[PDB]
Design a binder for this molecule. Structure first.
Ligand SMILES: NC(=O)c1ccc[n+]([C@@H]2O[C@H](COP(=O)([O-])OP(=O)(O)OC[C@H]3O[C@@H](n4cnc5c(N)ncnc54)[C@H](O)[C@@H]3O)[C@@H](O)[C@H]2O)c1
Ligand SMILES: NC(=O)c1ccc[n+]([C@@H]2O[C@H](COP(=O)([O-])OP(=O)(O)OC[C@H]3O[C@@H](n4cnc5c(N)ncnc54)[C@H](O)[C@@H]3O)[C@@H](O)[C@H]2O)c1
Ligand SMILES: O=c1ccn([C@@H]2O[C@H](COP(=O)(O)OP(=O)(O)O[C@H]3O[C@H](CO)[C@@H](O)[C@H](O)[C@H]3O)[C@@H](O)[C@H]2O)c(=O)[nH]1
Ligand SMILES: O=c1ccn([C@@H]2O[C@H](COP(=O)(O)OP(=O)(O)O[C@H]3O[C@H](CO)[C@@H](O)[C@H](O)[C@H]3O)[C@@H](O)[C@H]2O)c(=O)[nH]1
Lengths: 335, 335
């Protein structure tokens, strides 16, 4: 079984690539390295002793995607390629919509043309907006999105649902990830965005090891116990394993929806404290204004994925922080 | 004042082009003639005695759109370019999403780059789905869309709203058209799609003049008085005049929303009867199964546009049918 992994050099993709290769799948990557390094795929190969067939370029490049499908016999696609910062999306809506919607559309066109009709889409807790109830289930209504990123994910979900209406031989798996953190136990791979990290934990990891000065806490006036945002952090290895469980268990047509989270919510301040415990020293932080697009609190009821896929994310916030720092200590400037 | 009219050779665009030119605006067209003829723009020029500067090609062609903006000093854009059949959209979602979303995204990118920040978007009563109340106002909730076409219009509305969040110097006018019908009084221009017409009235006009055999009535089991779909038909000339009223009256930043309809709903059977009255003979029809994506009934409360723009659509269903047949009798195979 061959899996095409778009954005295949990114944070969640590289961890997924490991888990797929360890389970004897063959893996192909396409990535434009806008938020990642080609060295990450070298590390996947190092960890697994298995090849990743690498293509360099943009998922919106129809000629490139045509080559990918013409040169390979692909069974499944996992579509990670996307821009993913809630705050940046509010400021750069067209960059987000172009990248995120048009990558999906070009990919679907090529997949249809080659009759490859099994996709896992990297969707997001952001599709629930300000959650109608907590914890969030797959029955919690979507919509009320607060930022173009989240809107783009909900749009993409609908586009995919409409592909299945028009051709019900498709298998569409909408995985709504919550907030992955951490690194493969080896410390040879981890989260390495380009520029200043937009996500909380890679920023915190850099402050812990002295590569950035001060954690910027975006808002302390949310309707949460300590005022800072609450999220369901999931170890990136657990999330990666979730993808293998889908491909292991779903071999029929249909639209399938799963929340992938732990069910444990942690505030920003609690995350910093988990890193302080892992580092053995204070990590400087400052209270800053709210970031546009952020909501107060979201976390998952992932019962459905446990029942249907046999999968649960049990690595802890301490496992996340420790594995993160292990990577960052060994690789303080990343790749 | 120069207006770029994308889809500028289409049904509603060509009527709008006339009304703009008669009011002393300068008009530029870009169209790929997927559902129209270049001859239509010759007829606009004939009617008005004014030029239409013509570009041939696709709004998704960034190099073409760059040329359009580099070669001309554009004040306003009216974005008509789109695929527009509810039923076809259910069967061809990716064609619809690609054409409709990516044309908009390429256009916005170029407009931003040239600091042209005034747009009228051709939106649709379909954004209301199955209407929460009748008649529909601009306060009627959107969503519940029943077909990828309608979904694509609601998506585009949100993309445009997000452009204004990111740069509130924009003027965004979302015009939700109901169902335009009819032809310029000259009969030298009218509705001329390529292929078998997907809309009701061009099909009915062709059956009336013997160019098609039988009106296909899609469903007679809707929750309406006679069982057939109910719509708010608006004379295409009134709708065209609505666009001039926007540009005449709105010269400030902001997001502005208008329903453009008559407030008079007519069933399919009533439309056929209006054409029979205009033709002076029966027009054969048959009851057929429902078309995917169609809803029972929608019509507009257009009070807001009357107050804010001084505009009302008062041409009648008889004016629509008669002007339609006048065009079709003079041009039985269109252009
Ligand atoms: N918290 C999370 O990190 C989280 C949660 C839910 C969903 N997601 C989604 O999961 C996916 C992956 O997230 P991640 O944390 O691994 O981010 P990431 O930035 O590390 O990975 C995405 C990758 O896609 C690549 N890419 C982006 N657009 C591309 C394009 N047009 N063509 C080719 N390559 C492109 C980037 O270069 C990068 O390697 C994204 O779609 C994201 O929205 C992430
Ligand atoms: N009842 C109606 O007809 C109605 C109601 C509400 C909204 N609308 C919207 O109004 C607009 C115009 O409707 P119309 O009835 O004039 O249809 P139309 O098909 O006559 O006009 C649209 C035009 O756009 C052109 N076009 C389509 N995609 C293009 C692309 N990518 N690049 C260049 N040109 C392209 C076509 O060739 C055509 O000339 C559409 O966006 C439609 O969705 C129509
Ligand atoms: O430097 C930072 C970064 C973040 N935060 C806060 O930390 C929390 C998590 O923020 P972040 O890591 O930016 O993640 P989210 O915005 O919750 O979004 C992530 O999680 C979503 C699913 O929940 C994914 O879809 C997104 O792609 C991914 O970026 C939020 O409360 C932020 O306000 C800070 O205080 N400082
Ligand atoms: O051959 C036909 C065509 C249509 N209908 C019916 O006639 C009505 C109008 O149909 P149609 O002309 O296809 O228009 P709509 O589907 O209502 O959509 C039009 O009106 C929308 C705004 O209401 C626009 O956004 C769309 O682009 C435009 O195609 C509907 O009840 C249809 O079921 C028939 O019975 N036979």
């Amino acid at each position: 079984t061959t899996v095409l992994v778009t954005g295949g050099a990114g944070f969640i993709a590289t961890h997924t690539d490991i888990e797929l290769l360890n389970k004897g799948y063959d893996v192909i990557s396409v990535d434009n390295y806008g938020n990642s390094s080609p060295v990450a795929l070298e590390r996947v190969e190092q960890i697994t002793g298995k090849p990743v067939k690498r293509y360099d370029g943009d998922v919106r490049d129809e000629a490139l995607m045509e080559r990918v499908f013409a040169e390979n016999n692909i069974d499944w696609v996992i579509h990670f390629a996307g821009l993913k910062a809630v705050g940046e999306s509010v400021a750069k809506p067209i960059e987000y919509y172009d990248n995120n919607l048009y990558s999906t559309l070009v990919l679907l066109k090529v997949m249809k043309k080659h009759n490859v009709k099994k996709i896992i889409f990297s969707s997001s807790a952001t599709v629930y907006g300000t959650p109608k109830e907590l914890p969030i289930t797959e029955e919690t209504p979507t919509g009320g999105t607060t930022n173009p990123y989240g809107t783009s994910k909900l749009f993409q979900e609908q586009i995919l649902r409409d592909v299945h209406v028009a051709d019900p031989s498709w298998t569409i798996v909408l995985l709504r990830y919550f907030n992955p953190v951490g690194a493969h136990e080896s410390g040879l791979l981890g989260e390495d965005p380009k520029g200043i990290p937009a996500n909380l934990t890679p920023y915190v990891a850099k402050v812990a090891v002295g590569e950035l000065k001060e954690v910027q806490v975006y808002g302390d006036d949310y309707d949460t116990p300590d005022g800072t945002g609450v999220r369901d952090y999931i170890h990136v290895v657990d999330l990666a394993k979730g993808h293998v469980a889908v491909i292991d268990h779903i071999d029929k047509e249909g639209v399938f929806v799963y929340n992938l989270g732990t069910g444990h919510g942690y505030s920003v301040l609690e995350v910093i404290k988990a890193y302080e415990k892992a580092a053995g020293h204070p990590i400087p932080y400052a209270i800053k204004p709210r970031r546009p697009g952020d909501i107060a609190a979201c976390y998952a009821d992932a019962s459905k994925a446990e029942k249907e896929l046999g999968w649960k994310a049990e690595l802890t916030i301490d496992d996340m922080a420790a594995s993160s720092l292990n990577w960052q200590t060994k690789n303080p400037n990343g790749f």
